Design a protein around this ligand. Structure first.
Ligand SMILES: Nc1ncnc2c1ncn2[C@@H]1O[C@H](COP(=O)(O)OP(=O)(O)O)[C@@H](O)[C@H]1O
Ligand SMILES: [Mg+2]
Lengths: 367, 701
């Protein structure tokens, strides 16, 4: 009967039926083969553990996220994500649901083709639709205008939408957030004598990326108050009992989203991708793009964004103009609440790709 | 000419064919504009030449199928012709009311010494038939009563014993003890199930022995497949045994304060399932406030047409004095049942010097004191016996000592649960040995057995015990395929009539899938207890790991049903059987297969000071422990090889003797007169092999 909302994040892949309430399944995405020799002999241990059990098995597997820079690792592992989720998580039958898949706003072919085709031929789904993660965040906001931020691991995007079509000449994809922020946290945490070089153990870094990082009100002045060090040094406890005190690097890491030259990319910060996409939109329409800056995704849940972003954009944006940055609740599930609103909305059930139409066209004409 | 169309409320209804093509057979109902749908070959069966005829034997019905067989039974339900000859199988329908003709003594006196088929179908037409083979071929006969639970397999059994004690001598010295003692042993073994409120959880087998001249010489009743797994886990609407609810309900306060009994909610083996009593309005107000559970204060008495727990406690103790049981020995029987209740209330924990061992909890100190008073073994000596693994070094050398290695907390709970199943096992064998003592047999030759065991059992929550019950039905149906189909077609060619020696659709690959060594399901479950860190998920995945494909089984993920859509890979398995595909959930499978004691619990309960407890554990179970005797056998054993040994031993008594084929059909779920369900009655014809036997036999004649 009901449609199935599946968001192909890199997180935190999200799954839940079409309305009326929250996603049923959230899990850390990973597939991991056992990287040691089994002298007890098992018995019968898994060839591949998927998440959640592959996060209950850190230090004994080699974790591989199923999508890497928004592209699949191979569809052999991707299919194990799908099969595991539908059968061994959700408990949903393949031929009893219209599905909804998500992709990035700008992603190369044949990643949506090969996907659409393999899921139709393998699981035999009776209807399918593929939405960009940004468009679903517009439905979640409820507004009819604005620049949309899908910032998730490992690809962020800046999509401007104006009632009710997408603007071709101002769509920006920045590869700055969020896996490069995980890897950067691992690169500046060595500065305090720690090591996390092991693939599974990198997850422990991801968990410290969640809880203790904070964005400065201004870089230069937090560097000033760092010279007065005490409150910056906060003590985290690590699963083997180790106590870690991070302070300067604590505000340095998130600070990356402004002035990203520290990572190694020449492209400018969230600051400039916001301004430069707005200043490629027509003069008259710009008026309503200002104050409809809408954030989304889990990688915008660092503390100090959006009011760093607000103060910085408001300084460059035109004089006597209104610029409020709209930050909803629970942004990590924003995208999903988008998908839920879409597939529940009448009459757009008949804007899906159904099995008879797929049988006719195969992997051709995906538009 | 019309055909039969499957209807939801009638099962099968009459209807003509008004458009025809394979897989597009349009069947119009008879003078009804109802289900004007299309069918398939397995949804269309032909009808007879005329609908205004009903027959005693179904040998006169040419268009015989399941719709014409359920229609002959629907008409003979009206005319009260409950006993009906189907091929060579008696089908009996329970009318649930008193009909004088079946209770007439002239009916037994007419049928006295009369040949099968030259006289009407009746209960006494089967009991004379398994007596004429004693005079023809000189062979012993096993009466097997099959059918749904609460279908009259125990009540129709008393008609069979009444015919044998009236037409072939006066039989055994005093009959009526067998009739009186069946509700007595049903206190001990009957429980409450989803299928029927009064259901039997054991397979009794009466053995009436005779001599060379075919005169009765005595009796022996035993029991097969005891549901001891009901002790540890009761269920949700199911009860445990019916003796604990019959003992705490009405009995004295100068017996309940002394045996330290209390309301059902306090005891571990009564902390799951239904704690309510079966009662009626006068008996309910006779139950005192302290005897009520919180669920009884909330929902009161349970409803059954004949069970009254407070009523049945007087008819239990009257039936005890009728089998010769002394009132002081009834008090020793009450001390063992109360000792199981204060054994279950031992709660364990970890702690101590060993650290990885086990101790007991503080709140089980008042309960351990009442347990050592009831069993006859000391409290300190039971606390260092439940928690340890005794072994010795004497066998390996003259430096001998006997060490103790403390067990885990889960193995302390499994040893206490195995000690509780061991006491009730030998207690049930002591009650049937006390009744067997009053009618012993002298110089046996011929003998007439009467089986009373459950049919196919499947509902909303099936488990291990429903798989052992459905497997025992699958072994009996392969016995019936070589005794009802292979044997009878040898007899049509012994009269020169004709018919070929045609083969049936076998299930020998399924038999060598449940009990088969190495790759069978019970041989992978019995290996699970031998493993350290045993799990139901490892055992369920080990079946699908051992054989990837096999048409007799599938996991809930591969089942198309909605009920199985919510059940995961590691949560159950589905076996396709003669009665269809039945899912058995997996959880607590490790402990359900566990039922054994090592020497530290055996050299304490057997050696009890109490002669009664010591006699429950009678010789050779009780044996002296002494130097170099010389090995630690039998260790694990398991419920699955207890059941495989006791099932294959009854197969050697069935393959070696003649038999009678009786099926008892329940016409309505509420158990009252003049109500024909039609669809539930069809399910008892579809879960009893009736469709397959009435298609193979027909042939060229
Ligand atoms: N409280 C938090 N603070 C900072 N980052 C967070 C927080 N919670 C989650 N994240 C990051 O957000 C990511 C999840 O983002 P998500 O919205 O799932 O992106 P996508 O939907 O594209 O997969 C995780 O990789 C995690 O590192
Ligand atoms: Mg995304």
């Amino acid at each position: 009967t009901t449609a199935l909302v599946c968001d192909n994040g890199s997180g935190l892949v999200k799954a839940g039926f079409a309305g009326d309430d929250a996603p049923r399944a959230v899990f850390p995405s990973i597939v991991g083969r056992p990287r040691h020799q089994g002298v007890m002999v098992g018995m019968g241990q898994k060839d591949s553990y998927v998440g959640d059990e592959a996060q209950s098995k850190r230090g004994i597997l080699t974790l591989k996220y199923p999508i890497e820079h928004g592209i699949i690792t191979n569809w052999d592992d991707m299919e194990k994500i799908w099969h595991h989720t539908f059968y061994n998580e959700l408990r949903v039958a393949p031929e009893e649901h219209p599905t909804l898949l998500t992709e990035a706003p700008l992603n190369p072919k044949a990643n949506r083709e090969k996907m659409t085709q393999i899921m139709f031929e393998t699981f035999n789904v009776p209807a399918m639709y593929v939405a960009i993660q940004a468009v679903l965040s517009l439905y979640a906001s409820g507004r009819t205008t604005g620049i949309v931020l899908d910032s998730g691991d490992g690809v962020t995007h800046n999509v401007p939408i104006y009632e009710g079509y997408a603007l071709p000449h101002a769509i920006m994809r920045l590869d700055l957030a969020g896996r490069d922020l995980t890897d950067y946290l691992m690169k500046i945490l060595t500065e305090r004598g720690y090591s996390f070089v092991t693939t599974a153990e990198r997850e422990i870094v991801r968990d410290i990326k969640e809880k203790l990082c904070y964005v400065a009100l201004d870089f230069e002045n937090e560097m000033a108050t760092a010279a007065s060090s005490s409150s910056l040094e906060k003590s985290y406890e690590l699963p083997d009992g180790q106590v870690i005190t991070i302070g300067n690097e604590r505000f340095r890491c998130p600070e990356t989203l402004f002035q990203p030259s520290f990572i190694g990319m020449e492209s400018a910060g969230i600051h400039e991708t916001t301004y430069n996409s707005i200043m490629k939109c027509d003069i008259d329409i710009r008026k309503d793009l200002y104050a409809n800056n809408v954030m989304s995704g889990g990688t915008t849940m660092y503390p100090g964004i959006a009011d760093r972003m607000q103060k910085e954009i408001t300084a460059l944006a035109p004089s006597t103009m209104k610029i409020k940055i709209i930050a909803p609740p629970e942004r990590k599930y924003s995208v999903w609440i988008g998908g839920s609103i879409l597939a529940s909305l009448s009459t757009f059930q008949q804007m899906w790709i159904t099995k008879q139409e797929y049988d006719e066209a195969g992997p051709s004409i995906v538009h | 000419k019309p055909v039969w169309a499957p209807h939801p409320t009638d099962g099968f209804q009459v209807g003509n064919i008004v458009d025809i093509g394979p897989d597009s057979l349009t069947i119009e109902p008879l003078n009804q504009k109802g289900k004007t749908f299309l069918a398939l070959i397995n949804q269309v069966f032909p009808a007879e030449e005329d609908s205004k005829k009903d027959v005693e034997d179904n040998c006169s019905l040419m268009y015989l199928n399941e719709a014409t067989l359920l229609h002959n039974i629907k008409v003979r339900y009206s005319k009260d012709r409950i006993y009906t000859y189907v091929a060579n199988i008696l089908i009996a329908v329970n009318p649930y009311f008193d009909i004088p003709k079946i209770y007439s003594s002239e009916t037994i006196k007419s049928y006295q010494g009369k040949s099968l088929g030259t006289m009407p179908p009746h209960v006494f037409a089967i009991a004379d038939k398994a007596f004429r083979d004693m005079k023809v071929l000189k062979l012993s006969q096993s009466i097997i009563v099959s059918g749904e639970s609460g279908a009259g397999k125990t009540e129709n059994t008393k008609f069979v014993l009444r015919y044998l004690t009236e037409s072939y001598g006066t039989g055994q010295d005093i009959d009526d003890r067998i009739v009186e003692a069946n509700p007595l042993l049903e206190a001990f073994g009957n429980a409450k199930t989803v299928r029927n409120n009064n259901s039997s959880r054991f397979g009794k087998f009466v053995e009436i022995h005779f001599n060379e001249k075919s005169s009765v010489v005595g009796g022996f009743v035993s029991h097969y497949l005891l549901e001891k797994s009901r002790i540890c886990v009761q269920g949700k609407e199911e009860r445990n045994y019916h003796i604990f609810y019959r003992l705490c309900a009405g009995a004295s306060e100068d017996i309940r304060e002394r045996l330290h009994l209390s309301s059902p909610d306090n005891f571990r083996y009564l902390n799951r399932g239904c704690t309510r009593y079966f009662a009626n309005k006068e008996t309910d107000k006779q139950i005192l406030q302290n005897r009520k559970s919180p669920e009884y204060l909330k929902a009161g008495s349970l409803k059954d047409p004949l069970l009254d727990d407070h009523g049945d406690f007087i008819r239990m103790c009257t039936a005890m004095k009728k089998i010769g049981l002394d009132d002081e020995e009834k008090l020793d029987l009450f001390r063992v049942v109360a000792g199981v209740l204060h054994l279950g209330n031992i709660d364990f924990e970890e702690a101590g010097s060993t650290s990885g061992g086990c101790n007991l909890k503080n709140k089980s100190t008042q309960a351990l004191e009442y347990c050592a008073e009831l069993l006859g073994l000391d409290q300190d000596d039971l606390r260092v016996s439940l928690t340890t693994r005794v072994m010795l070094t004497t066998a390996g050398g003259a430096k001998g000592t006997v060490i103790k290695v403390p067990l885990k907390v889960e193995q302390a709970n499994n040893a206490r649960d195995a000690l509780a199943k061991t006491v009730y096992s030998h207690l049930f064998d002591h009650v049937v040995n006390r009744v067997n003592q009053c009618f012993p047999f002298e110089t046996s030759s011929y003998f007439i057995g009467v089986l009373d065991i459950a049919g196919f059992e499947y509902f909303e929550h099936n488990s291990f015990e429903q798989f052992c019950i459905n497997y025992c039905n699958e072994k009996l149906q392969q016995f019936f395929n070589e005794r009802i189909l292979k044997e009878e077609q040898e007899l049509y060619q012994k009269e020169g009539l004709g018919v070929n020696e045609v083969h049936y659709v076998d299930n020998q690959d399924c038999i060598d899938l449940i009990e088969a060594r190495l790759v069978g399901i019970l041989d992978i479950l019995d290996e699970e207890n031998r493993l350290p860190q045993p799990s139901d998920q490892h055992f369920t995945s080990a079946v699908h790991q051992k054989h990837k494909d096999h048409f007799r089984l599938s996991i809930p993920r591969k089942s198309k049903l909605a009920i199985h859509r919510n059940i995961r890979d590691d949560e159950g398995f589905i076996i396709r059987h003669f009665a269809g595909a039945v899912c058995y959930e997996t959880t607590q499978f490790v402990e359900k297969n566990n039922d054994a004691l090592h020497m530290s619990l055996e050299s304490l309960i057997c050696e009890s000071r109490d002669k009664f407890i010591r006699e429950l554990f009678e010789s050779s179970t009780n044996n002296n422990k002494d130097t170099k005797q010389k090995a630690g056998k039998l260790s694990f054993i398991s419920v699955g090889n207890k059941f495989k040994t006791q099932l294959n031993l009854l197969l050697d008594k069935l393959r070696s003797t003649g038999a009678s084929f009786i099926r008892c059909i329940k016409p309505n779920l509420k158990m009252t007169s003049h109500h024909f369900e039609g669809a539930q009655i069809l399910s008892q014809l579809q879960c009893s092999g009736m469709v397959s036997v009435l298609d193979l036999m027909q042939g060229g004649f």
